Amino acid sequence: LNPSARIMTFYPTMEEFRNFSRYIAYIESQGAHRAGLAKVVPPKEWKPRASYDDIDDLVIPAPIQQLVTGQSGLFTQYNIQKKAMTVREFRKIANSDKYCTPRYSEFEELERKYWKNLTFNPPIYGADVNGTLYEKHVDEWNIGRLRTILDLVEKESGITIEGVNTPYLYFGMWKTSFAWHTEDMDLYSINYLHFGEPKSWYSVPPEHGKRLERLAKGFFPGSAQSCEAFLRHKMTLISPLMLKKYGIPFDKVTQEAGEFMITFPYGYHAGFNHGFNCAESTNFATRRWIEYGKQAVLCSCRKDMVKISMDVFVRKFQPERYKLWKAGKDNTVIDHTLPTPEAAEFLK
Ligand SMILES: CN(C)NC(=O)CCC(=O)O
Ligand SMILES: CN(C)NC(=O)CCC(=O)O
Ligand SMILES: [Cl-]
Ligand code: NI
Ligand SMILES: [Zn+2]
């Protein structure tokens, strides 16, 4: 399904929305994973929070100033940690005439201004803030407790990895970016825009992921030479015009307040925020993910880089391959077009 591998949008009914793992299995049966990214608009009647009016006190312990250097569509982003600040302090900086959204008529225009001005007037991103904005009673798509098999890490080793099996919050402002990357251990990820201006996304089909990597390696040989997974440093920006010029397939989509974005295993993506907004996200998994976990190329140059032990997963979900895998002889080749097993029932 989905032979063009374009980003799909879904509209679950409340009945469909209730079972998260089941709906993820559903959209995959429709080919949604092929684009590496998919949007899910929740039923009009759902809401994770009554109001977002008491958080002006929330502290953003580590805001980041995003300095970007580059030319001709190729850039490197340097984060500079600023002193803690609360939301109030952030919104005002964000809406001030110095950092606010430019005037525009269409998205094509804002996109152009982004790529033309990303190296100028470095903005601040209140990123990676531990926490959730969900009310403790919301049981549908609660990013704080999705109950997928990824819980097996916490559940067998008590190991929690901030932002991975725990929720993160991001407060952005015009021009703040997320560099090209796949998730840690090439996991899935879910992102919910709580409020504010839109966030635009770019994505490359998992099946064409290696092509993006060769492109990046070609443009940054030094970086490539010292880390086998330098894109995991989340510092590399490449414009759609460069992607188009070198033949890399990609699609773009704009997520609005109240919408979810799901990224799939080995799906490269990047993007930027339109203005002041707040988003929440975490990582999750399905059975199809295990093979990806086992074959993910990891960052070989830093410390505290996320490394999940695939052992408990192979043991429990692939008992017949455990011995071969342990011996380093498991040579399964991943087929990026195959939906996850849990999708069987929608393919009857
Ligand atoms: C988890 N991942 C899909 N989320 C993103 O890449 C967006 C992060 C951001 O909003 O800066
Ligand atoms: C129930 N939900 C998970 N799935 C759907 O509504 C789609 C069912 C189908 O495959 O037509
Ligand atoms: Cl280089
Ligand atoms: Ni991501
Ligand atoms: Zn590295």
Side-chain angles (χ1 to χ4, degrees), residues 1-96 98-224 226-328 330-348:
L1 308 92
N2 194 25
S4 42
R6 293 203 95 211
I7 299 181
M8 301 178 190
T9 293
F10 296 84
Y11 297 81
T13 48
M14 193 63 178
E15 261 287 70
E16 279 154 12
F17 200 60
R18 286 197 172 83
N19 195 333
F20 180 69
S21 296
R22 182 187 186 64
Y23 202 65
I24 294 302
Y26 167 62
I27 62 181
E28 289 208 350
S29 70
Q30 303 299 289
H33 55 291
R34 293 195 69 171
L37 184 61
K39 176 191 292 193
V40 174
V41 176
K44 330 289 95 71
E45 39 149 333
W46 182 82
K47 236 95 206 216
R49 199 192 195 33
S51 76
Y52 297 96
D53 307 55
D54 41 39
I55 72 170
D56 305 36
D57 283 341
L58 228 182
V59 53
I60 290 158
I64 297 293
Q65 180 148 44
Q66 304 185 308
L67 269 76
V68 178
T69 183
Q71 67 187 305
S72 309
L74 311 181
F75 309 86
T76 294
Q77 175 176 270
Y78 290 86
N79 296 342
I80 292 177
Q81 196 170 313
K82 304 299 272 191
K83 62 193 180 61
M85 77 189 60
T86 107
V87 176
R88 219 181 290 99
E89 256 130 54
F90 194 75
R91 187 179 6 237
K92 302 178 76 63
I93 297 179
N95 303 127
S96 76
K98 187 190 160 67
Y99 296 96
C100 61
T101 304
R103 286 215 175 172
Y104 66 107
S105 48
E106 48 186 59
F107 165 65
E108 306 133 53
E109 188 175 2
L110 199 55
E111 181 177 34
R112 265 178 306 229
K113 287 177 184 187
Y114 167 72
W115 289 104
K116 173 182 186 57
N117 305 298
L118 88 177
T119 64
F120 312 141
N121 187 51
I124 314 269
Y125 198 13
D128 305 336
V129 305
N130 288 113
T132 168
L133 292 190
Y134 274 67
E135 275 160 6
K136 59 197 155 168
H137 72 286
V138 183
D139 301 333
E140 305 80 20
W141 292 47
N142 191 309
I143 289 174
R145 52 197 171 94
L146 299 170
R147 315 315 270 254
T148 75
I149 64 177
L150 178 65
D151 292 331
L152 272 291
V153 155
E154 164 281 315
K155 175 185 183 69
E156 277 249 340
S157 69
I159 289 189
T160 71
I161 306 169
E162 294 190 329
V164 184
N165 47 21
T166 65
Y168 258 181
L169 288 171
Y170 304 76
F171 294 95
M173 65 171 65
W174 160 242
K175 232 149 58 63
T176 53
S177 328
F178 51 105
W180 280 107
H181 68 279
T182 61
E183 303 302 317
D184 284 309
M185 296 309 290
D186 290 342
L187 282 153
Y188 287 75
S189 76
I190 175 171
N191 180 302
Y192 177 75
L193 201 51
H194 283 293
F195 58 77
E197 308 309 347
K199 181 195 304 293
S200 284
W201 304 65
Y202 295 106
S203 64
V204 169
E207 47 197 284
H208 293 120
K210 288 297 169 188
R211 308 200 42 195
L212 173 62
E213 292 181 354
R214 289 200 292 283
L215 192 65
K217 176 166 172 179
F219 290 132
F220 303 97
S223 288
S226 54
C227 177
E228 54 180 38
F230 83 92
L231 291 172
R232 290 200 189 280
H233 298 162
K234 295 175 193 198
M235 284 170 71
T236 305
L237 302 176
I238 306 175
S239 77
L241 290 181
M242 276 304 261
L243 286 202
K244 176 171 183 272
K245 178 182 184 175
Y246 284 90
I248 305 306
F250 73 92
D251 203 358
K252 51 191 74 179
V253 68
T254 299
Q255 161 193 34
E256 323 254 341
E259 306 181 320
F260 290 94
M261 291 308 304
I262 297 298
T263 75
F264 302 79
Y266 202 55
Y268 273 103
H269 54 285
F272 62 86
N273 296 294
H274 291 203
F276 174 67
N277 59 24
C278 179
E280 179 172 335
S281 60
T282 197
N283 292 131
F284 69 88
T286 77
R287 267 134 70 178
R288 182 168 73 81
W289 167 69
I290 299 168
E291 205 54 61
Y292 284 91
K294 300 162 64 194
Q295 297 185 47
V297 177
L298 308 185
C299 167
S300 69
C301 77
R302 299 179 170 183
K303 301 85 53 57
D304 284 4
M305 286 309 103
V306 183
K307 188 182 193 308
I308 290 170
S309 161
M310 294 310 290
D311 226 285
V312 57
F313 291 97
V314 187
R315 250 197 289 109
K316 180 178 170 183
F317 298 102
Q318 307 180 336
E320 78 283 7
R321 308 194 71 78
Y322 194 70
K323 204 151 96 156
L324 199 67
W325 177 67
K326 276 268 86 145
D330 185 331
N331 276 41
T332 298
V333 163
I334 291 167
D335 173 351
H336 303 300
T337 75
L338 258 37
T340 195
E342 300 100 310
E345 45 151 348
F346 295 114
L347 295 152
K348 295 298 175 198

